Amino acid sequence: ERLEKYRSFERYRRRAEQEARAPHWWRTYREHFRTQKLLERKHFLRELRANVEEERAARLRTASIPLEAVRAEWERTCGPYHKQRLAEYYGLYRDLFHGATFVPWVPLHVAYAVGEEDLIPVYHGNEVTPTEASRAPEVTYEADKDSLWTLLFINLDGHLLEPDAEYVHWLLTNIPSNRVAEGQETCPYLPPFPARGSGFHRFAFLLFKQDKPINFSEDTRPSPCYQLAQRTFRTFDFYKRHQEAMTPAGLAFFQCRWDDSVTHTFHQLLDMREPVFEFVRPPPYHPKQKRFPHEQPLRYLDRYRDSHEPTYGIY
Amino acid sequence: KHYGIKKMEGHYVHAGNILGTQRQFRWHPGAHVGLGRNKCLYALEEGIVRYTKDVYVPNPKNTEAVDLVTSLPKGAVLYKTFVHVVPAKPEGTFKLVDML
Amino acid sequence: LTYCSTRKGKRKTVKSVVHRFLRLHSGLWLRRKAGYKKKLWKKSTARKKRLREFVFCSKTQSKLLDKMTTSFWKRRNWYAGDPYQMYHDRTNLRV
Amino acid sequence: KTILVKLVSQAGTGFSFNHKRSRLREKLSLLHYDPIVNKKVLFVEQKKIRSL
RNA sequence: UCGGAGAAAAUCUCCGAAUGAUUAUAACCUAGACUUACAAGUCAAAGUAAAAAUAUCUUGACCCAGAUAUUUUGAUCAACGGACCAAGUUACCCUAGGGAUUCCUAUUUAAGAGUUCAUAUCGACAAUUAGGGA
RNA sequence: AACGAGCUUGGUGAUAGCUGGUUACCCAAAAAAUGAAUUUAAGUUCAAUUUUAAACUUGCUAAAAAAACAAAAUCAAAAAGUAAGUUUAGAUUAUAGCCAAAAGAGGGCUCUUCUGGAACGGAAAAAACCUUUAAUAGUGAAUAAUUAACAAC
Ligand SMILES: [Mg+2]
Ligand SMILES: [Mg+2]
Ligand SMILES: [Mg+2]
Ligand SMILES: [Mg+2]
Ligand SMILES: [Mg+2]
Ligand SMILES: [Mg+2]
Ligand SMILES: [Mg+2]
Ligand SMILES: [Mg+2]
Ligand SMILES: [Mg+2]
Ligand SMILES: [Mg+2]
Ligand SMILES: [Mg+2]
């Protein structure tokens, strides 16, 4: 009686949600399964508050917000933190770098040109068909001059033969500053080739900060390389080699399904028969067959038969 | 009759199996556990049985539960016992059908 | 049961089994469920579905019915278009 | 007190199912699934089967 | 006969049901299980079909007779696993068997009786591991 | 010369869930009297137990933590001591115990559950208490339990 009462469902609901997150002695479901900037911000807020027209629109519930400006502000101010999560969510860190986490910093931008001025922005988690990505995309990340860099494209999930592998679609090296035409083309551009019926393959675009010019002779690939087998690659080993001069700073990843262009890639240049995959479930569980299925219906005998056609044995 | 726990914690349960029978809600359905007409609890996925306490939140519509829940001491909330089955297999796998 | 008949000296079938059960050549027996035609108005829909089914017999019940019928009811019958043609044999049975 | 009636489909099929009504309540009629027609149709009471 | 509550699962302590009204009318099919001598009785994913998910709350076999045009209905068979349909009586009796044939009293205590005075003769409360008599 | 209904022969080897009886040797294993239905409780059928053969693989004890109510019956990974267990096929008998000890429930007795017992030795005589792995020949030996015990200012 001393304590007050919630008197509202919402107040109880929020309290309950917090408690579940907190650890408990008893088993639970979760176990099993600077200052100047602040002053500047306040000044802008007062100016916005002072504006009668802004208040007039708000009280008329007609006001709106420009998404374009917020998006640019979000990328600069706090976007990388969100960008880190979507990399953690998709498991990029736990795959490429065996659980090591690198916060992206450079707001990297990628887009695939389609015929004319219709660019498909490659954000994080976007969906892009293989047909659109037939040709290499335009990369812009405002490296600034005197800024050595390196760019890498990787499919993460692929390498039909090897499970723990990841093909490199193309690696530009010694990229000096923003401009990318000056990069050394260690690997030419391959079109996306996600096999039919294999789900959503996730492709990522990662950029490393290049401290000093290093010749990646052991990484150079014979251009043109159409011997897919050679495209075998694993970032961890590559990064470890050059970890001294390579530090990641940018991310951009899309996921793509199979498409008719994939058939073209497998045949024309990969020069092999295209593999087809299908989602196969385990056979249903049946208790061991009994000689006398007491009290079981006539369907019982059908569960354990293999062939659906009659046999006649010795007859 | 013979109400009780048909499957004890830690047992490998197959889908459809019945875990417990009750005249009244001694346990509540948890994760991947279904509720029957007679209030019996059965496995919706093949897995391992797990019993765990958890906070209880009722549907907003029902007056009796919202009233009781609302008229609770601000400090803490009531709990209940739940039954869960931990799925032990992947849904399916991809295999090579043919090379064309 | 009649074990030795006065006229023919044989066992006799109990014609109450012949009119209630079907024997599959493998050794199984089928039956109906008692009450499946009775007071259907007060039976639940799930209950009625269970009643309509053809059901198997236990080992001891089958042993009894085998005693009560003669060999002629245990032979292999080659009926054209038989709806139990596929149920006269067991498949994938290790036991 | 109550009686067992036979609701008969008015869709032209012979499908019928038995229901209960109160001797005081008026003659019954309901929408019910007709398997032969595979549609919901009106079932109207035609005959009594027994007094239950 | 079955169900609900206590004893707490062996016999005891209590209430009810042989349904009732409401209704969205609640389909077909099919993994895995519960319960169980047999018999009967429970729960249910997936698929399909209707609609635009939902039935909510608190029980009797087989045979044999019916009714409609496949669909269905028949029990205070309540002795409730139910003989289609049968009561008294015997000391005139018989056979097969099984059995059997509170109040004393002795101890311990001692308020009160006995004019006075507990124990001359007795005697409340009690004490004896104390002896008998629908 | 035995009349509630004569006697004789036949039906007739009437029937009897009841009483009695049921004939050589040796080896081996071995329950119960729990549960269920029954004009059924002097019977029988099923489960359960036991048993014989066969197939192949885990069983018994113990079992943490953690769970279902709670300060031990379910359940029960790894181990460890050990050799059994599941399924298939065939099959009867049994379904009334007895006494001691322990906890309850009714109300001394009487129900229920848990443990043990069935000497040829000891307790006097002693089915049920204690000592005792089977059963053999020996004019060997070490041992177990073992009705006996030592008024008090
Ligand atoms: Mg059964
Ligand atoms: Mg469904
Ligand atoms: Mg009777
Ligand atoms: Mg009875
Ligand atoms: Mg007289
Ligand atoms: Mg005789
Ligand atoms: Mg008898
Ligand atoms: Mg017993
Ligand atoms: Mg019964
Ligand atoms: Mg009877
Ligand atoms: Mg073990």
PDB file of C-alpha atoms in Angstrom, chain A residues 288-302 304-312 315, chain C residues 27-28 30 33 53-59 61-62 76 78 84-87 90-95:
ATOM      1  CA  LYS A 288      10.616 -46.663 -35.635  1.00  0.00           C
ATOM      2  CA  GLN A 289       8.241 -48.900 -37.563  1.00  0.00           C
ATOM      3  CA  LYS A 290       6.426 -51.574 -35.566  1.00  0.00           C
ATOM      4  CA  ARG A 291       5.253 -55.002 -36.672  1.00  0.00           C
ATOM      5  CA  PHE A 292       1.870 -54.316 -35.030  1.00  0.00           C
ATOM      6  CA  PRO A 293       0.891 -50.618 -35.239  1.00  0.00           C
ATOM      7  CA  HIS A 294      -1.776 -50.913 -32.577  1.00  0.00           C
ATOM      8  CA  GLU A 295      -4.562 -48.329 -32.860  1.00  0.00           C
ATOM      9  CA  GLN A 296      -2.870 -46.541 -35.775  1.00  0.00           C
ATOM     10  CA  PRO A 297      -4.808 -45.640 -38.946  1.00  0.00           C
ATOM     11  CA  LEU A 298      -4.303 -47.145 -42.402  1.00  0.00           C
ATOM     12  CA  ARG A 299      -2.022 -44.228 -43.332  1.00  0.00           C
ATOM     13  CA  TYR A 300       0.639 -45.747 -41.065  1.00  0.00           C
ATOM     14  CA  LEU A 301       1.940 -48.121 -43.736  1.00  0.00           C
ATOM     15  CA  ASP A 302       2.368 -45.321 -46.293  1.00  0.00           C
ATOM     16  CA  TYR A 304       7.491 -46.005 -44.283  1.00  0.00           C
ATOM     17  CA  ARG A 305       7.227 -47.003 -47.954  1.00  0.00           C
ATOM     18  CA  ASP A 306       9.803 -45.929 -50.535  1.00  0.00           C
ATOM     19  CA  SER A 307       8.188 -46.622 -53.924  1.00  0.00           C
ATOM     20  CA  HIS A 308       4.694 -45.408 -54.802  1.00  0.00           C
ATOM     21  CA  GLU A 309       4.170 -48.161 -57.397  1.00  0.00           C
ATOM     22  CA  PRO A 310       3.131 -51.793 -56.867  1.00  0.00           C
ATOM     23  CA  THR A 311       5.643 -54.621 -56.961  1.00  0.00           C
ATOM     24  CA  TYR A 312       4.896 -58.266 -57.654  1.00  0.00           C
ATOM     25  CA  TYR A 315       4.961 -63.255 -59.815  1.00  0.00           C
TER      26      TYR A 315
ATOM     27  CA  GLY C  27      -0.509 -60.520 -40.728  1.00  0.00           C
ATOM     28  CA  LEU C  28      -2.241 -57.300 -39.736  1.00  0.00           C
ATOM     29  CA  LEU C  30      -8.117 -53.788 -39.735  1.00  0.00           C
ATOM     30  CA  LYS C  33     -14.114 -47.900 -34.134  1.00  0.00           C
ATOM     31  CA  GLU C  53     -10.813 -44.194 -39.581  1.00  0.00           C
ATOM     32  CA  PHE C  54      -9.712 -47.754 -40.317  1.00  0.00           C
ATOM     33  CA  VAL C  55      -7.471 -48.912 -37.477  1.00  0.00           C
ATOM     34  CA  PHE C  56      -5.000 -51.718 -36.793  1.00  0.00           C
ATOM     35  CA  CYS C  57      -5.173 -54.405 -34.110  1.00  0.00           C
ATOM     36  CA  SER C  58      -2.690 -55.299 -31.399  1.00  0.00           C
ATOM     37  CA  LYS C  59      -0.432 -58.346 -31.386  1.00  0.00           C
ATOM     38  CA  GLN C  61      -5.840 -59.320 -30.700  1.00  0.00           C
ATOM     39  CA  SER C  62      -4.334 -60.464 -34.002  1.00  0.00           C
ATOM     40  CA  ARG C  76      -3.141 -64.244 -50.919  1.00  0.00           C
ATOM     41  CA  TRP C  78      -5.293 -61.432 -56.461  1.00  0.00           C
ATOM     42  CA  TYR C  84      -5.714 -52.819 -50.501  1.00  0.00           C
ATOM     43  CA  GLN C  85      -3.221 -54.116 -53.067  1.00  0.00           C
ATOM     44  CA  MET C  86      -0.358 -52.078 -51.597  1.00  0.00           C
ATOM     45  CA  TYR C  87      -1.125 -52.840 -47.926  1.00  0.00           C
ATOM     46  CA  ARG C  90       5.521 -54.551 -45.269  1.00  0.00           C
ATOM     47  CA  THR C  91       8.363 -52.353 -46.516  1.00  0.00           C
ATOM     48  CA  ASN C  92      11.474 -51.080 -44.717  1.00  0.00           C
ATOM     49  CA  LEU C  93      10.604 -53.144 -41.634  1.00  0.00           C
ATOM     50  CA  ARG C  94      13.602 -54.002 -39.437  1.00  0.00           C
ATOM     51  CA  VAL C  95      12.278 -55.412 -36.175  1.00  0.00           C
TER      52      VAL C  95
END
